[PDB]
Design a protein around this ligand. Structure first.
Ligand SMILES: O=C1c2c(nnn2Cc2ccc3ncccc3c2)CCN1c1ccccc1
Length: 286
């Protein structure tokens, strides 16, 4: 670790993010997750954790920047946002994250084992809105909000994941290669202006959130299955939105349409979404 290379402000914060090799046993025997950048394994820190390797990439880039990203992410603390436990050095560094017993939100709602009520699903969405409210107040744009990118712990607490050092493509099926810029993009979750410009804002996160609400209410159906990749722009511009799911409350569909407002600055803040969804949520029993 090259301490002088860092922003002098961040030097103190390093000891709080770095995990000593002797504090962490990672069980490389079974893969429990797969990303484009690397595999993840059970880890023991006595705390049970998910340890993500990054050795599938050629290079992590600047080590000082890697550390910086880690420091920024560690200071984030909210019950609906996945935390960073730390970084452990060994080849490539290991990302140490909490173990999420019930996996990703999309698979959770698709799972025939669990039977979430409409109230449960709305509540999952509310927790996401709250996670996103915190992230937006930190001026952080997620860029890849989707049900696949949120996770549930042992107490079914929903946490926005897939950001900072945990960022990766964990389900490659839903990402498309752009023509002019070789980037791999979650087009079916993206706002119109993002599809056109490839710029992401909190307001395009709000668009993605609307889609995530639709995923929740369809128990994990794929959005726009009869649309092909980048022809989604054509489809939307025909004057189309995802349809109201069978058990989606009318006011909740209205929230979704608001999230998909053609004017980015007219979409609701995440604070307004927390408010509106909490109200809809309170009307249900069971
Ligand atoms: O794998 C992930 C993921 C995310 N952010 N960090 N990660 C890595 C991660 C974090 C905690 C875990 N806990 C238990 C098992 C695997 C884990 C992976 C986003 C969602 N996700 C995932 C998992 C399964 C399928 C699709 C996406």
């Amino acid at each position: 670790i090259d301490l002088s290379a860092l922003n002098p402000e961040l030097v103190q914060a390093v000891q709080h993010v770095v995990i000593g090799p002797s504090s962490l046993i990672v069980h490389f025997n079974e893969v429990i997750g797969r990303g484009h950048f690397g595999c993840v394994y059970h880890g023991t820190l006595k705390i049970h954790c998910a340890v993500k390797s990054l050795n599938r990439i050629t290079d992590i880039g600047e080590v000082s920047q890697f550390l910086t990203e880690g420091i920024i992410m560690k200071d984030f603390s909210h019950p609906n946002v996945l935390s960073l436990l730390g970084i452990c050095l060994r080849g490539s560094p290991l990302v140490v994250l909490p173990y999420m017993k019930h996996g990703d939100l999309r698979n959770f709602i698709r799972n025939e084992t669990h039977n979430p009520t409409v109230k449960d699903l709305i509540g999952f969405g509310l927790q996401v809105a709250k996670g996103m409210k915190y992230l937006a107040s930190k001026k952080f744009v997620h860029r890849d909000l989707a049900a696949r990118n949120c996770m549930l712990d042992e107490k079914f607490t929903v946490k926005v994941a897939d950001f900072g050092l945990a960022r990766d493509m964990y389900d490659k099926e839903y990402y498309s290669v752009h023509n002019k810029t070789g980037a791999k993009l979650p087009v079916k979750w993206m706002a119109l202006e993002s599809l056109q410009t490839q710029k992401f804002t909190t307001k395009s996160d709000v668009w993605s959130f609307g889609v995530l609400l639709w995923e929740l209410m369809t128990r994990g159906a794929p959005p726009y299955p009869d649309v092909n990749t980048f022809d989604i722009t054509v489809y939307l511009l025909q004057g189309r939105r995802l349809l109201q799911p069978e058990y989606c409350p009318d006011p909740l569909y209205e929230v979704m349409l608001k999230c998909w407002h053609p004017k980015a600055e007219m979409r609701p803040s995440f604070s307004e979404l927390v408010s509106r969804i909490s109200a809809i949520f309170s009307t249900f029993i069971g």
